[PDB]
Amino acid sequence: SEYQDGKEFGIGDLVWGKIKGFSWWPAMVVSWKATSKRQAMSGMRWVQWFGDGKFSEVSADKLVALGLFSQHFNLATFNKLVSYRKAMYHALEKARVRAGKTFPSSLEDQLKPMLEWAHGGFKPTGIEGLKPN
Numbered sequence: 001s002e003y004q005d006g007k008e009f010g011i012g013d014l015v016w017g018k019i020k021g022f023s024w025w026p027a028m029v030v031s032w033k034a035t036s037k038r039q040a041m042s043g044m045r046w047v048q049w050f051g052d053g054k055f056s057e058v059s060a061d062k063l064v065a066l067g068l069f070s071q072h073f074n075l076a077t078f079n080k081l082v083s084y085r086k087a088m089y090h091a092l093e094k095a096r097v098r099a100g101k102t103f104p105s106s107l108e109d110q111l112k113p114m115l116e117w118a119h120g121g122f123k124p125t126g127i128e129g130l131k132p133n
């Protein structure tokens with residue numbers, strides 16, 4: 001059906017997506033029917049960006065699994081842009097729920113254990129616990 005071109009990533013997958021002149025940003029792969037636009041060209045994936053809920057058509061080669069977290073987390077962007085910090089909250093919150101993970105109980109101070117768990121490699125489940133369903 002949709003996204004049957006050999007290439008990686010399917011609907012529901014949490015991803016890092018790279019847009020021109022922007023840091024890697026966290027996203028979720030969605031089906032084209034959620035975007036009110038059009039089917040993705042073969043080799044592309046529709047994604048919805050965490051933090052602003054906007055849709056983009058991105059090459060499957062400009063996406064990586066959000067579980068590869070420390071490799072694409074941009075510490076400088078996290079320090080400069082409040083939107084990037086917001087996007088990290090919603091993205092990692094979704095990772096938490098899927099993982100079966102919970103954290104003891106502000107924004108910075110809520111991010112802290114989420115960031116550490118993500119940077120540390122999503123323990124104990126590892127990246128397998130970020131899958132959809």
Ligand SMILES: C[C@H](O)CN(C[C@H](C)O)C[C@H](C)O
Pocket residue numbers: 019022025049050051052054083087
């Ligand atoms: C979170 C905000 O949408 C930031 N990016 C800039 C965009 C051009 O508005 C987009 C994408 C998430 O990389």
